[PDB]
């Protein structure tokens, strides 16, 4: 009903599950109930470096909706929906298979601050490296999980990934 966005994949809707810079409570929405659940408390002393959530009405390679990191000037509360522009994607493989993480900034009607951020490489490399580091290490204390983090790909690649996931949801 919220949908992936009328202008997808150029701008997409993201339902936030975890706020930027929050305590490590990992919420997740249930598709059945529509309820927000605590999936876990992260066992590592790490925090999500962006707001984190998913694009409704998408099926990514691993069967779940596409996950998105939304960089913003302030945290967005879990359960809120935000319109965002994909700027890149971090490829990674984990215990679920292919589990890429799209990186996005707010749509310009939501905040003009990130207007000149078009690809992930327009952001500081140290910040991009913090994201890679986060996914590389946040699951290290969970013995049956693992993450092998790959490379960043550009906004175009992130948009094609989203396109594929939207088509998978229609099928």
Residues near a second copy (CB under 8 A): 1-2, 15, 21, 23-25, 27, 33, 35-41, 43-49, 72-83, 106, 109-116, 124-127, 129-131, 133-134, 137, 140-141
DSSP state letter for 49: S
Any bridge partners for residue 40, and if so which? 26
Least distance (Å) between residue 40 CB and a second copy: 5
Least distance (Å) between residue 56 CB and a second copy: 10
Backbone phi, psi, residue 57, to 5°: 65, 40
Least distance (Å) between residue 99 CB and a second copy: 18
Q: Which amino acids are annotated as binding site, given as ranges? A: 26, 40, 52, 62, 67, 99, 138
39: left (phi over 0), alpha (psi -120 to 50) or beta: alpha
Least distance (Å) between residue 164 CB and a second copy: 25
Q: How many residues comprise the chain?
A: 171
Least distance (Å) between residue 66 CB and a second copy: 18
Of the two residues 10 and 129, which places its CB atom closer to a second copy in the complex? 129
Could you count the other beta carbons within 10 Å of the beta carbon of residue 62? 16
Distance of alpha carbon 128 from alpha carbon 125, whole angstroms: 5
Of the two residues 139 and 159, which places its CB atom closer to a second copy in the complex? 139
Q: Which amino acids are annotated as binding site for Mg(2+), given as ranges? A: 62, 67, 99
Of the two residues 29 and 102, which places its CB atom closer to a second copy in the complex? 29
Distance of alpha carbon 19 from alpha carbon 46, whole angstroms: 13
Of the two residues 139 and 157, which places its CB atom closer to a second copy in the complex? 139
What secondary structure does DSSP assign to 114-160, as a single string? Answer: GTT--SGGGS-HHHHHHHHHHHHHTTTTSTT--EEEEEEEEHHHHHH
Of the two residues 74 and 171, which places its CB atom closer to a second copy in the complex? 74
């Amino acid at each position: 009903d919220i949908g992936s966005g009328s202008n997808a994949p150029e701008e997409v809707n993201v339902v936030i599950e975890v706020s930027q810079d929050s305590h490590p409570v990992k919420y997740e929405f249930d598709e059945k109930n529509g309820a927000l659940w605590v999936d876990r408390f992260l066992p590592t002393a790490m925090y999500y470096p962006c707001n984190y959530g998913f694009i409704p009405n998408t099926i990514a390679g691993d069967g779940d909706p596409v996950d998105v990191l939304v960089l913003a000037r302030f945290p967005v509360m879990p359960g809120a929906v935000i319109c965002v522009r994909p700027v890149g994607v971090l490829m990674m493989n984990d215990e679920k298979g292919e589990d890429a993480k799209v990186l996005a900034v707010p749509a310009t009607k939501v905040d003009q601050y990130y207007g000149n951020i078009v690809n992930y490489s327009d952001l500081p490399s140290s910040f991009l490296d913090s994201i890679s580091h986060f996914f590389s290490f946040y699951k290290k204390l969970e013995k049956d999980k693992f993450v092998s983090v790959g490379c960043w790909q550009d906004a175009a690649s992130a948009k094609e990934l989203i396109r594929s996931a939207i088509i998978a949801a229609k099928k």
